[PDB]
Amino acid sequence: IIGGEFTTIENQPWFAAIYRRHRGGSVTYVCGGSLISPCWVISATHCFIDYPKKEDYIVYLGRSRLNSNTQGEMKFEVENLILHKDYSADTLAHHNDIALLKIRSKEGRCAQPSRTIQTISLPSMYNDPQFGTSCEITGFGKENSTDYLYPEQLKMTVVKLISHRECQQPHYYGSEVTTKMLCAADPQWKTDSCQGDSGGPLVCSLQGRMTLTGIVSWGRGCALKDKPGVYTRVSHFLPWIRSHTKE
Numbered sequence: 001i002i003g004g005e006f007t008t009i010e011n012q013p014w015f016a017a018i019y020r021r022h023r024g025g026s027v028t029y030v031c032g033g034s035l036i037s038p039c040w041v042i043s044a045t046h047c048f049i050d051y052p053k054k055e056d057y058i059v060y061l062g063r064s065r066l067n068s069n070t071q072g073e074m075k076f077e078v079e080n081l082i083l084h085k086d087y088s089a090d091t092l093a094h095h096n097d098i099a100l101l102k103i104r105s106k107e108g109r110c111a112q113p114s115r116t117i118q119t120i121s122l123p124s125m126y127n128d129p130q131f132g133t134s135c136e137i138t139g140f141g142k143e144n145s146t147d148y149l150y151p152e153q154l155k156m157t158v159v160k161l162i163s164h165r166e167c168q169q170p171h172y173y174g175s176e177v178t179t180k181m182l183c184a185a186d187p188q189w190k191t192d193s194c195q196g197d198s199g200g201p202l203v204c205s206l207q208g209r210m211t212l213t214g215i216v217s218w219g220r221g222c223a224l225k226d227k228p229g230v231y232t233r234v235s236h237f238l239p240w241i242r243s244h245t246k247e
């Protein structure tokens, strides 16, 4: 997250931290995620497409820091990694960048609701907030495009939804952005999501309720003028989400 503020897991109870084990024992951070149900975390497919092995991932809930523990946190193994089959990456656009991670603790249990661990509500069929609406994003991603390290503490910021018409302008992204994607940015281009925030949640208050409106997917640079963040439009994938989370 470029700019924005430091926050704790208490303020983002549905945020899931995903790590990958390496040969030797070194675990590195991979991507953000969101707990949508006790046994399921939703994220982005491009985070795992190069290493489809479920056995090498670790999911953390109730965690506020990157490389240290937090009281109340819970560790999970990935029982099943569901990548979208029509995923593809073009020059800039990442299509169908969405993924499901079924989780289970070593005792074979799913997440237990606490003050630091809660689910986030999914939207309704083609029912998104009005353009110009403020939403929030959370992540352990870069604070500056030039950094090579990630902040140790979780962060968040607020951005506004941009209309599909505006995001499709020549100086923005042109035809790279489709209706399955959502654009959001700070009107002053000061704050934004960045490398390392992928798979994290774009939350919007819709009719007095926090809703997982999007998933951090892509963008040109970070906090660059007329280069909004692009998010996978959750509302267009409900059918896909339900068919894979049943049995």
Ligand SMILES: N=C(N)c1ccc(CNC(=O)CNC(=O)[C@@H](CO)NS(=O)(=O)Cc2ccccc2)cc1
Pocket (backbone or CB within 6 Å): 090, 091, 092, 093, 094, 145, 192, 193, 194, 195, 196, 197, 198, 216, 217, 218, 219, 220, 221, 222, 223, 224, 227, 228, 229, 230
């Ligand atoms: N809101 C943003 N600007 C933003 C959101 C998410 C990411 C994370 N996702 C990726 O990096 C995946 N790749 C991209 O978006 C690529 C194009 O397909 N564009 S990029 O190379 O400009 C992103 C980038 C990479 C390294 C450092 C800064 C920016 C980056 C920027």
